[PDB]
């Protein structure tokens, strides 16, 4: 219901100059303080600094390592909060957040959106390839099946990937891009009853947002 | 400004064991005319936003389970996991909110479990992939425990190390159990010069290797 939604990630070289949103809704924007926050794959958290409500002016605090490098604005009929971030270096590559914040007086709740990722590299983007995994022509295993999808070739992260929408979510394994040079390959696993595929309609969704590529693969036996 | 520092590194235990785990700040946070501690902690299941668990080193988010407790005042602070759950596997973070904001390094909470054999599975190229000129052959070593296991390919019998990609999940929160990719990748050309080909995974649970493979004849 309350939601806070993060967009404008994706890549960007060095020194270069990227812009993030974080869209809400759900609750009274002008009366809450609103903070971003990010994370470096496989890193801790990092608080980046934080913009007041109304009734204390939008006012602004930042931490140390984005200190006039960094800033932070609000769109208070948009209900839309921004970061500007400005000569961008390798380190700064990370997932970033914005949270509903707040003065720790009131008696709230807190929310945080999924985050979006920023990479900084001199790469070029670069769309993925997405292949069936079907069995082989060869003997089956038992009642259950295991389907899968490579996502391959790639740049930069990340990709999503969804199995017939989202419907089939409980037995899938999707693992972490590997990267290989300037590109990412990944795959994900489904595993389903016999009874299910090839009967019924099994097919991965996949996602890049970079290249705003969308590739829906049926697996279909060999 | 307020530096936290979190301890240990790790935890490991196994499902319905407790844990605690250790924060302490460079400074009070300890607001005297609130008599509020401004530390709060947070979990972080993979793939996932922070999650608020606790705030004012007491106070327990609406939702959050009475197995999840935090004590201390002042500079030193405790998170306190009763009856440790699988779905507990995560990256547990305080932060202080007494002078603007600050999260502490984290600590991984992993499970312990009892000993699982991957089930394994092996995929040749699709069509698709060999039009494009390439060729991977894709290996799945899902549900395992622990998440020690080696892989070795064969193409025709031979051992093969050049164009394989590794790739492990992080720990299943349903089950506590561990699964890998590995991807032999080849030109068309060579993909199609041999005939067999083998995945093969050596796990603790077993001196003699799962294996999995196919024939690029086979009917
Ligand atoms: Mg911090
Ligand atoms: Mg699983
Ligand atoms: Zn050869």
């Known amino acids: 219901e309350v939601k806070l939604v993060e967009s404008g990630g994706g890549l960007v070289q060095s020194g270069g100059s990227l812009r993030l949103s974080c869209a809400t809704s759900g609750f009274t924007f002008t009366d809450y303080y609103m903070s971003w926050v990010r994370q470096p794959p496989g890193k801790a958290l990092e608080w980046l600094g934080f913009?007041?409500?109304?009734?204390?002016?939008?006012?602004?605090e930042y931490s140390p390592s984005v200190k006039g490098r960094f800033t932070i604005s609000r769109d208070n009929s948009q209900s839309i909060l921004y970061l500007q971030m400005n000569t961008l270096r390798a380190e700064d590559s990370a997932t970033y957040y914005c949270a509903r914040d707040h003065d720790g007086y009131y008696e709230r709740f807190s929310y945080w959106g999924q985050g979006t990722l920023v990479t900084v590299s001199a790469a070029k983007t670069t769309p993925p390839s997405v292949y069936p995994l079907a069995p082989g022509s060869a003997a089956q295993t038992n009642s259950m099946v295991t389907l899968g999808c490579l996502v391959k070739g790639y740049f930069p992260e990340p990709v999503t990937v969804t199995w017939n929408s989202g419907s089939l979510s409980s037995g899938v394994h999707t693992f972490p891009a590997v990267l290989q040079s300037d590109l990412y390959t990944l795959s994900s696993s489904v595993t389903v009853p016999s009874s299910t595929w090839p009967s019924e309609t099994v097919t991965c969704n996949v996602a890049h947002p970079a290249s705003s590529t969308k590739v829906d693969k049926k697996i279909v036996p060999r | 400004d307020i530096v936290m520092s979190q301890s240990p590194s790790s935890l490991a235990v196994s499902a319905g064991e407790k844990v605690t785990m250790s924060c302490k700040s460079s400074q009070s946070l300890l607001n005297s005319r609130t008599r509020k501690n401004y530390l709060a902690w947070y979990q972080q299941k993979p793939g996932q936003s922070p999650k608020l668990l606790i705030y004012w080193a007491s106070t327990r988010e609406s939702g959050v389970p009475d197995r999840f407790t935090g004590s201390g005042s002042g500079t030193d602070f405790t998170l306190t996991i009763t009856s440790v759950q699988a779905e507990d596997l995560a990256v547990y973070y305080c932060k202080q909110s007494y002078n603007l904001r600050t999260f502490g390094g984290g600590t991984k909470l992993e499970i312990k479990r009892a000993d699982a054999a991957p089930t394994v599975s092996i995929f040749p190229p699709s069509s698709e992939q060999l039009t494009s000129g390439g060729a991977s052959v894709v290996c799945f070593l899902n549900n395992f425990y622990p998440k020690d296991i080696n892989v070795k390919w064969k193409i025709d019998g031979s051992e093969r190390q050049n164009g394989v990609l590794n790739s492990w999940t992080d720990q299943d929160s349903k089950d506590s159990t561990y699964s890998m990719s590995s991807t032999l990748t080849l030109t068309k050309d060579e993909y199609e010069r041999h005939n067999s080909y083998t995945c093969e995974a050596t796990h603790k649970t077993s001196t003699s290797p799962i294996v999995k493979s196919f024939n690029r004849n086979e009917c």
């Open positions: 913009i007041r409500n109304k009734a204390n002016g939008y006012t602004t």
